[PDB]
Amino acid sequence: SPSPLNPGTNVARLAEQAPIHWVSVAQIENSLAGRPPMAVGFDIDDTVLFSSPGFWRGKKTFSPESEDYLKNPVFWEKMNNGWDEFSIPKEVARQLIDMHVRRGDAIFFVTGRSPTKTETVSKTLADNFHIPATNMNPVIFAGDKPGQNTKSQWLQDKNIRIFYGDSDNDITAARDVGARGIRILRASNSTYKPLPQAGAFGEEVIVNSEY
Amino acid sequence: SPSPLNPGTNVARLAEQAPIHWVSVAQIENSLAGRPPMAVGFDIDDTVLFSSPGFWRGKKTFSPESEDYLKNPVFWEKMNNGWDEFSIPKEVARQLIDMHVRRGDAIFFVTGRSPTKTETVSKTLADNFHIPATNMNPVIFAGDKPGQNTKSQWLQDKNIRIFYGDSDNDITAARDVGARGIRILRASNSTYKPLPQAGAFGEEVIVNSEY
Amino acid sequence: SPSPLNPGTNVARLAEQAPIHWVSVAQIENSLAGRPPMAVGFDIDDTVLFSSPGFWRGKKTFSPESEDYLKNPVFWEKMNNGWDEFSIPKEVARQLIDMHVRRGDAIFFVTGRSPTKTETVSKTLADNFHIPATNMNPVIFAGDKPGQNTKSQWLQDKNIRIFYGDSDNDITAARDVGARGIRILRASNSTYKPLPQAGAFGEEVIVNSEY
Amino acid sequence: SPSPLNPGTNVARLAEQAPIHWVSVAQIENSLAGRPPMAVGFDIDDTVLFSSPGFWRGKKTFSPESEDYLKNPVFWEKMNNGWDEFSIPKEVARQLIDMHVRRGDAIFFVTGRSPTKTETVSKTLADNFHIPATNMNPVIFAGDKPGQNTKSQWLQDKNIRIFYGDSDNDITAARDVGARGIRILRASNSTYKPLPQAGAFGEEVIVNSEY
Ligand SMILES: [Mg+2]
Ligand SMILES: [Mg+2]
Ligand SMILES: [Mg+2]
Ligand SMILES: [Mg+2]
């Protein structure tokens, strides 16, 4: 934009692959065969939930021309107490959570969302992903503080050994504590842009994980 | 057949292309050079709005174990009177609508959603896509119920010359009346499954139109 | 080169399509249903034959540090009198030639190779592609003359209505005479580089035609 | 199942990735930082040379209606004593060989080609890949005939630590002796079909290695 009307292509380009370590859920499960129960963790937004609907409504409602809504407690109170009714669960997360429950793993959610007075997100997640009481843990609302990775200390405190996420800070949080960081693709219709460069730390990336 | 742990791949598969007539917005615009203002139409769901958030919420709320919510007046009243605040506008639609408005074309929206006593979808569309009053037209609810007209009939009635849509029936509606049916890709995280085979009738398909 | 060790990617990029009019042999055949026999034409190199072996040997033998071999009659005499024994027929060409024979079309080959005193290329092609005597025509060695498209006059003289080729000059030769130019992908292991931008004239490009 | 004229596609399919451990030459080089000179090995056919031109010519000449040419001493004498002048060196091999030569590694070639009284393949490889005398080693012909040793046995004998190849048996040869087997993609225009499933054993596969 502007760009050629008819750009064309060639077969080198058509076949070209980025050097990324792609994995499947089955390969992950296999890599863990025989490992006793451990703590694992998931980012929420664009990892287990397509939550752009609420973030989109939030932006339009609270800061149509800026990102200020993300620092607005009135927004977080809406986002954490019912707007996830419009959040669409990701199939990759159904498969991963089922797999970790099968293993007897403890499941944590560690999100950059700000903490609120009350939250119904933990219930939404347990219900939608059919997580038994024993495997489920209340969502950790780690917040966002420029200059800090707010998730890293939580991964250490909960002894989380595998952390799934869509953002660079999810992968580097895992790296910070020596955990296995595994990338989920953010959907291209997410309102959180630009899309991250999945694989840019040499981490495993789950195939087809945009849905 | 087994789904092997390590299925591998090969370069025939990597380079394989489906025989699709892909087009860009710029190519479509070029094809209309010198053509006077005309009526054009858009399907709504998965064409201009990723509306799955409301449909997802509707299914959970009104028929968690069936598709009955789609025949439930209580759902439609919610879906057509505010749940599109959580619908995510598609960039392909922003570009198409901008291009057609610039041409002075009349913009119509023709949806298979069930009609309701009131609807705020028209306003949502005009506001989000910055459609001037002179180009905007209230949403048309098309279908097979008594007193309704089909998508085809509405295309005919409004002399719509190009119809954009994600579903097979959008393309056939256009074909049935000699209009130009152009396909938009349904996002893979849509809750309306299975995904259509874009290009199934040899129609033009807009590149990168999943977002 | 140099470039990031771990470049990563994202799902917009993974799904991204160039706006190209891809077609299959079956679609081409269907587009011609009911059309009586006509003359059609094929480029040779990287269209029907992977002839890089001979061109590679030629370069090494006659001009290791330049492109001068392509103006050397000693090279052309080798290339046109047996080095095509090492040229690998393309499956796309088997399918197209079979289809055109089925139609009763007259088949021509129009190549940028230079003419020689004798040539066994016509025999190689008739033999390998099982072309009956009635459909077969002796190869036209049109040569290469910077500033001219040497193929265009031949397409006009033989009333060729469809011309298949891998190079830009094949497509523009067709355009020059009002014929239907259809692009075949040059294989990425061809020694003729850079690869052309297939589709850069808005022409049809045959899927999977690199082999 | 029908192969429809207009099969269409969808964005799940467009974005679909096989779970492959893709790597680049730069990543492999990085993994060897600080490692002293070692022996490394390459398969020949479809790993470093696109040798299909000679194999194609051999099949046509010696067994047009079978695979018997591969057991024909007359073919092998031609194939190993000059027909590689028509073989096209692979760019991936240029990069790997350059990288390993720069490391001071010993370069071995281990092929399943039948042995002959004389062979000029070693010279072809040294000349085309600019392999210095100190790094070069004569081609090893491995197999199951009396007095031969298998690829595995030769890897063991030469203490080859990394083995590059296109076929399953190249990867298993490395695996059988605890060497690092790294896969190169076989070009889709190779006459050796079907193409292998690169990554079938969870091994590293070099990106873009079809040329
Ligand atoms: Mg996230
Ligand atoms: Mg729709
Ligand atoms: Mg050519
Ligand atoms: Mg090989």
Token readout for C172 is 């523009």
Residues of chain D contacting A24 with CB distance shorter than 8 Å: 19
| Cβ-Cβ contacts under 8 Å for D13 (sequence gap 6 or more) | B18
Contact indicator for C189, D211 with CB cutoff of 8 Å? yes
R_g over Cα of chain A: 18
Ion ligand 4 residues within 5 Å by Cβ:
D 43, 45-47, 166-167
Q: A17 contacts in B (CB within 8 Å)? A: 14
**Rounded to an integer, what distance in angstroms lies between the CA atom of residue D121 and that of residue D124?**
5
> Is the CB of D10 less than 8 angstroms away from the CB of B202?
no
Length of chain B: 211
DSSP 8-state assignment for residue A105: -
Chain D interface includes B2 (CB < 8 A):
no
Residues of D within 8 A of A18 (CB-CB) are 22, 207
Residue A45 CB-density burial (10 A; 0-12 exposed, 13-18 middle, 19+ buried)? buried
Residue C152, helix vs strand vs coil: helix
Name the residue facing A210 among D15, D19, D210 (closest C-beta). D15
Shortest distance, CA B158 to any CA of chain A (angstroms): 31
Residue carrying structure tokens 């959970």: B60
Nearest to C181 by CA among C190, C168, C192: C168
Residue A165: DSSP 8-state = E
DSSP structure string for chain B: ----SS--B-HHHHH-----EEE-HHHHHHHTTTPPP-EEEE--BTTTEE-HHHHHHHHHHH-TTSSGGGG-HHHHHHHTTTGGGG-EE-HHHHHHHHHHHHHT-EEEEEE-SPP-SS--HHHHHHHHHT--TTT----EE--SSTT---HHHHHHHTTEEEEEESSHHHHHHHHHTT-EEEE-PPPTT-SS-SPP-BTTTS-EEETTTT-
Number of C-alpha atoms within 13 angstroms, CB side, residue C58? 27
Query: How much distance in Å is there from the Cα of A96 to the middle of ligand 1?
Result: 16
Beta pairing, strands B180-183 & B160-165: parallel
Residues of D in contact with C56 (CB under 8 A): 86, 88
Residues in chain D: 211
Q: Which of A24, A30, A53 sits opposite B88 (nearest CB)?
A: A53
Q: State the best of C204, C208, C209, C210 to mutate against chain B, taking most chain B CBs within 10 Å.
A: C208
- Integer CA distances (angstroms), C166 to A9, C23, C46, C181, C206, in order: 12, 15, 6, 10, 10
Q: Is C43 annotated as a binding residue?
A: yes
Q: Going by DSSP bridges, is the β-strand pair A160-165/A39-42 parallel, antiparallel, or unpaired?
A: parallel
* Contact partners, residue A161, CB within 8 Å, separation at least 6: A38, A39, A40, A179, A180
Residue C59 among known ligand-binding residues: no
Most distant CA pair in chain A, distance: 58
Please, are residues B118 and B147 in contact by the beta-carbon 8 Å criterion?
Answer: no
- What single-letter amino acid sits at B58? G
Asked if A97 reaches chain D (Cβ–Cβ under 8 Å), the answer is no
Q: Where are the beta strands (DSSP E) in A58-190?
A: 88-89, 106-111, 140-141, 160-165, 180-183
Amino acid identity of residue B57, one-letter, is R
A57, D165, A204, D147: which is closest to D155 by C-alpha? D165
Query: CB–CB of B53/A86 below 8 Å?
Result: yes
Residue D52 forms contact with C (CB below 8 Å): yes
Task: Give the nearest chain B residue to C203 (CA atoms).
Answer: B21
d(CA D152, CA D176): 7
Instruction: Report the residue of chain B nearest A187, measured CA to CA.
Output: B189
Taking the centre of ligand 1 as the mean of its atom positions, its distance from the CA of residue B90, in whole angstroms, is 21
**Whether the Cβ atoms of residue A104 and residue A143 lie closer than 8 Å to each other:** no
CA R_g for chain C: 18
Phi, then psi, of A61 in degrees rounded to 5: -75, -45
Q: Please, what is the Cα angle at B189 between B187 and B191, to 5 degrees?
A: 100
Place of tokens 């505010």: B82
Our measurement of the distance from residue C195's CA atom to the centroid of its chain's CA atoms, rounded to an integer in Å, reads 13
The Cα-based distances of D107 to B153, C4, D39, D89 in angstroms read: 73, 27, 6, 16
Nearest residue to C192 via CA among A12, B112, A37, D68: A12
State the distance between the two ends of chain B, measured CA to CA, in whole angstroms.
Answer: 34
Judge contact between C47 and C93, C-beta under 8 A: yes
Among D17, D60, D90, select the one facing C14 at the smallest CB separation.
D17
Tell me, yes or no, if B92 comes closer than 8 A to chain D by beta carbon.
no
Nearest CA in chain A to C194: A10
The Cα–Cα gap between D95 and D108 comes to 15
A15: contact with D, CB 8 A cutoff: yes
Query: Which H or E run includes C78?
Result: helix C73-79
Is residue D118 within 8 Å of residue D78, measured between CB atoms?
A: no
Query: Among all ligands shown, which has an atom nearest to the Cα of A198?
Result: 1
Instruction: Tell me whether residue B157 is one of the annotated catalytic residues.
Output: no
Method: X-ray
DSSP state of A86: G
For an interface test with A, the pick among B23, B79, B88, B185 (most A C-beta atoms closer than 10 Å) comes out as: B88
Is D111 marked within a binding site?
yes
C-alpha–C-alpha distance, residues A27 and D199, integer Å? 13
Residue B166, annotated ligand binder?
yes
d(CA D133, CA D136): 5
Put simply, whether A188 touches C (Cβ < 8 Å) is yes
Contact C27, B19 (CB under 8 A): yes
Find out whether D208 and D89 touch, Cβ atoms under 8 Å: no
> Which listed ligand is nearest to B90 at the C-alpha?
2
In angstroms, the CA B31 to CA B126 distance is: 26
Q: Mind telling me the catalytic residues of D?
A: 43, 45
Tokens of D89: 């060196």
d(CA D75, CA D54): 9
Q: A165: which strand partners?
A: A183
Please tell me the distance from the alpha carbon of residue A50 to that of residue A89, in angstroms, as a whole number: 6
The two structure tokens encoding residue A164: 């799934």
Is there a contact between B140 and B148 (Cβ–Cβ < 8 Å)?
A: no
C1-211: CATH architecture: 3-Layer(aba) Sandwich (3.40)
- A60 to chain D, closest Cα gap in Å: 28
Spatial CA neighbour of D14 closest among C99, C41, B187: B187
Evaluate whether A160 touches A179 at the Cβ level (below 8 Å): yes
Q: Are D158 and D130 a contacting pair, CB within 8 Å?
A: no
Whole-number CA gyration radius for chain B: 18
CA-based Rg of chain D, rounded to a whole angstrom? 18
What is residue A18's DSSP assignment?
-
| Three state DSSP letters for B181-197 | EEECCCCCCCCCCCCCC
Nearest to A10 among C6, C12, C197 (CB): C197
User: C176, C149 in Cβ contact below 8 A?
Assistant: yes
Distance of CA C73 to the CA centre of its chain: 22
What is the β-pairing status of strands A49-50 and A88-89? antiparallel
Interatomic CA distance for residues D70 and D64, integer angstroms: 12
Closest CA to B92 of B28, B154, B177, B176: B28
| String of DSSP letters for chain D | ----SS--B-HHHHH-----EEE-HHHHHHHTTTPPP-EEEE--BTTTEE-HHHHHHHHHHH-TTSSGGGG-HHHHHHHTTTGGGG-EE-HHHHHHHHHHHHHT-EEEEEE-SPP-SS--HHHHHHHHHT--TTT--PPEE--SSTT---HHHHHHHTTEEEEEESSHHHHHHHHHTT-EEEE-PPPTT-SS-SPP-BTTTS-EEETTTT-
CA D15 / ligand 3 centre spacing (Å): 31
A91 token code pair: 């199939």
* Residue D154, both tokens: 């030769």
Question: Which residues of chain A are within 8 Å of residue B86 when distances are taken between CB atoms?
Answer: 53-54, 56-57, 83, 86
Q: Which residues contact B194 (CB under 8 A, 6 or more apart)?
A: none
| 3 state SS of C180 | strand
How far, in Å, is the centroid of ligand 1 from the Cα of D167? Answer: 40
Bridge partners of B111, per DSSP, are B141
Q: Is the Cβ of C8 closer than 8 Å to some Cβ of chain A? A: yes
- Report the amino acid identity of residue B40: V
Q: Which of D29, D13, D15 is nearest to D206 (CA)?
A: D29
Residues in chain D closer than 8 A to C86 (CB atoms): 53-54, 56-57, 83, 86
What is the helix (H) or strand (E) element at residue C26, kind and residue range?
helix C25-31
Residue D156: how many other CB atoms lie within 10 Å: 16
**3-class SS of residue A183:** strand
Quick check: D7 and B15 CB within 8 A?
no
Residues of A in contact with D17 (CB under 8 A): 22, 207-208
Entry resolution (Å): 1.5
Alpha-carbon torsion angle D59, D63, D68, D74, nearest 10? -80
Residue pair D143/D150 in contact by the 8 Å Cβ criterion: yes
Q: Which H helix or E strand runs over A156?
A: helix A152-157
Question: Which residues, in sequence order, are bridge partners of residue B205?
Answer: B22, B183
